């Protein structure tokens with residue numbers, strides 16, 4: 001079996017959000033629903049990553065560090081892919097039952113958040129990215145940041161990232177070109193991967209949880225310790 005065929009088989013199914021359209025939309029209802037769906041997608045990202053060949057032989061500390069640094073990137077990228085594929089990049093397709101149409105986008109705070117995710121979709125559309133390219137690109141997002149002080153098994157990590165870079169290469173060559181166009185396309189796709197760092201930067205500035213949510217989650221002694229208690233190398237193909 002080829003390596004991309006194995007990526008295809010472990011690719012997560014698309015989850016429903018459990019949003020009901022029988023109530024008028026509100027920003028609260030959508031964000032609340034997205035909170036639940038986002039937790040579920042993280043669980044599915046971990047399960048996917050744990051079956052990535054190479055990656056899965058890193059110590060768990062390395063695997064968990066990589067996931068910590070990349071889960072938002074992976075979810076925004078797959079969101080981008082879904083939106084491109086289901087709606088030709090017209091609409092943000094969080095889930096088959098939760099699509100942000102032109103009207104939901106005028107809801108308070110929707111445009112500002114969504115415009116960053118719609119950028120991913122529109123780039124996949126502009127570049128006409130193939131499914132095999134997408135699978136390899138998405139694995140590379142898992143391997144796109146490391147601790148400043150290095151992983152436990154940095155040498156293995158290097159080997160694994162290089163094998164998925166070469167896999168991306170093989171997906172571009174299959175899709176097509178007469179030499180100049182393979183390298184142009186490699187340039188373009190690796191620029192998109194780089195730009196995912198900036199997408200995630202914007203997306204991290206949004207509200208994770210409220211005070212009510214925080215209060216219900218934690219016992220007071222533990223929150224106290226947190227209060228008393230008051231680095232990352234972004235791997236770039238291009239400077």
Ligand SMILES: CC#C[C@]1(O)CC[C@H]2[C@@H]3CCC4=CC(=O)CCC4=C3[C@@H](c3ccc(N(C)C)cc3)C[C@@]21C
Nearest residue numbers: 034035037038039042075076079094113114203206
């Ligand atoms: C509209 C909107 C919006 C956002 O606030 C910004 C990016 C969304 C994120 C992208 C990546 C993402 C892709 C999806 O498929 C919707 C799920 C999703 C989200 C949302 C989310 C909510 C909670 C978490 N936690 C608790 C693990 C993770 C993701 C909502 C995000 C943060």
